[PDB]
């Protein structure tokens, strides 16, 4: 057994989320500096707050040290295994790993674009969305009515219209396990 008394939790959530990890420990006599490790490597430029509290009358008595790492905007590069590191004399202790994963609503890579057409004439609209998590099921709408019964059925990435005879609109919903994001509303102008 080691000097760590609690281990970094996890933080999993969407891009831009701010969260913290913290490990705390107990040492004897003036405390060591606690470093953080992304994937077993020192983090050199990271928002952290160490908190030291002595338990005896003196600075020579036991101490409760505790570092908190701050991620302000959870971008994808922040992903992976985190753990604390303390050098105690001529010996190296490390905490249990915490994980930061990143997951959230779908994200559109393609959305239906406005178009103008003579119609009744064929045309196609696109709609692509990604996670994580996967898969992401698509659902089309024409004049804000769904066309199909649940995400996943029926038309998905490409929507073919035999052709309309009157200006209409078309939205796209993207569902995954976290929830739904809805696309711009394309307007298809007809002459």
């Amino acid at each position: 057994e080691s000097p760590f008394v609690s281990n970094p939790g996890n933080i999993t959530g969407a891009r831009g989320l701010t969260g913290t990890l913290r490990c705390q420990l107990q040492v004897q006599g003036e405390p060591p500096e606690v470093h953080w490790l992304r994937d077993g490597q020192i983090l050199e430029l990271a928002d952290s707050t160490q908190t030291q509290v002595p338990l005896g009358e003196d600075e020579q008595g036991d101490w409760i040290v505790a570092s908190q790492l701050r991620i302000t905007s959870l971008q994808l590069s922040d992903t992976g295994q985190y753990q604390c590191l303390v050098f105690l004399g001529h010996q190296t202790f490390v905490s249990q790993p915490g994980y930061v994963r990143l997951e959230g609503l779908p994200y559109f890579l393609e959305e239906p674009e406005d178009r103008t057409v003579a119609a009744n004439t064929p045309f196609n609209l696109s709609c692509q969305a990604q996670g994580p998590p996967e898969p992401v099921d698509l659902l089309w709408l024409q004049d804000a009515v769904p066309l199909a019964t649940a995400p996943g059925h029926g038309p998905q990435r490409s929507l073919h219209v035999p052709g309309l005879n009157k200006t209409s609109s078309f939205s796209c919903e993207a569902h995954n396990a976290k929830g739904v994001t809805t696309s711009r509303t394309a307007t298809i102008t007809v002459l």
Partner: protein, 386 residues
């Protein structure tokens, strides 16, 4: 005084949404701002109701606004943005009876709805809910209902929401006023603890306009009573004053642990079956009745009795039922109106938790024609343990 007592404990720091059967909002806020302003609304929420309106925000009936609602136990967002209706429904289950944080914001060129700080809907929108008028920016907000008629939503819904709300934060205001007036008005507070059911506190009843026409009358009552007497389910001919069918609790028996209760299946004034039952032990029970010309059976926790009528009597009652049912009839739940005690054995109000399926269809008190105000539609308080 009741054989089983239920908890009366309320939560001073809470807002009850289902206070008014009319569907009127339990709070109406009105904001005027100098700078342009994005809507933000956070609050904690807890319900079993699978359908109703959480809040409305925006402006005139047909103009530009959002309504955050429940339907099939999941969040539903409706929008009008210049005459373009639109509705989105998604996210996890809400009506699980457990507190959770819901939030709505105008973040960017989107609406973002979160459950427990984790986004469940991003709806793309171009436009602001706050509307300029007279050098200022206006927005109206209303909780637990809309300011306009429910027919003029994008999607009709039954706004009536038996749900509880706490730790609210409307546009980061510091107006302890709702909080204050809730303290002084216990009608506006919810049960500290809730459990699945519908509580009949026994001061009123509810009724429906149900058809039974060949004909069935099937009823399954899941009950956990407080009192030993009262009407579970009944039919009313408004014109004749009559009570074509009733299912009720009564008692008088004769040992220490005063048993003592019976369930009574009954046409008008004469019983058809009688079955002993132990309602006053805090356990749930299933009374269940199945009629149709020729047949009439009363089960209690999966147990039939055999009738109180010869079979000749049975037909000369079911023909009287058949008759009543050809005309329109009201389906009562939890009591009858004031009537002669000669027209039906029990006329009393029911006290306690009860659920009712009628003809294989589950009754929803929010859907009732009338529903007395103290009857909570989708939550029961728990049993007091002394």
């Amino acid at each position: 005084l009741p054989c089983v007592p239920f908890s009366v404990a309320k939560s001073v720091k809470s807002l009850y949404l289902g206070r008014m059967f009319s569907g009127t909002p339990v709070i109406r806020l009105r904001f005027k701002r100098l700078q342009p302003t994005r809507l933000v609304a956070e609050f904690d929420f807890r319900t079993f109701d699978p359908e109703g309106i959480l809040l409305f925000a925006g402006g005139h009936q047909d103009s530009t606004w959002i309504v955050l609602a429940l339907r099939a136990g999941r969040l539903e967002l409706q929008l009008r943005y210049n005459g373009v209706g639109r509705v989105t429904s998604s996210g996890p289950v809400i009506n699980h009876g457990m507190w959770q944080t819901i939030s709505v914001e105008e973040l960017a060129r989107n609406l973002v709805i979160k459950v427990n700080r984790d986004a469940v809907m991003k709806i793309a929108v171009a436009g602001d809910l706050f509307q300029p008028e007279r050098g200022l920016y206006h927005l109206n907000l209303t909780v637990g209902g809309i300011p306009f008629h429910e027919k003029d939503l994008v999607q009709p819904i039954n706004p009536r929401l038996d749900g509880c709300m706490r730790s609210w934060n409307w546009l980061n205001g510091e107006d302890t006023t709702i909080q204050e007036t809730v303290k002084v008005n216990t009608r506006m507070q919810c049960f500290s603890v809730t459990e699945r059911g519908s509580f009949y506190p026994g001061s009123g009843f509810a009724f429906y306009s149900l058809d039974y026409m060949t004909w069935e009358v099937e009823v399954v009552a899941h009950i956990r009573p407080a009192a030993d007497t009262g009407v579970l389910f009944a039919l009313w001919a408004p014109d004749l004053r009559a009570v074509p069918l009733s299912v009720a609790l009564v008692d008088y028996h004769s040992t220490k642990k005063l048993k003592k209760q019976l369930v009574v299946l009954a046409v008008e004034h004469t019983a058809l079956a009688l079955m002993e039952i132990k309602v006053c032990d805090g356990q749930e029970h299933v009374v269940t009745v199945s009629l149709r010309d020729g047949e009439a059976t009363l089960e209690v926790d999966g147990t039939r009795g055999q009738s109180e009528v010869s079979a000749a009597q049975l037909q000369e009652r079911l023909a009287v039922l058949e008759r009543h049912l050809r005309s329109p009839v009201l389906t009562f739940a939890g009591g009858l109106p004031d009537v002669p005690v000669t027209s039906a054995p029990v006329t009393a109000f029911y006290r306690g938790c009860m659920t009712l399926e009628v003809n294989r269809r589950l009754l929803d008190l929010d859907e009732a024609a009338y529903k007395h105000s103290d009857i909570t539609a989708h939550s029961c308080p728990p049993v007091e343990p002394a």
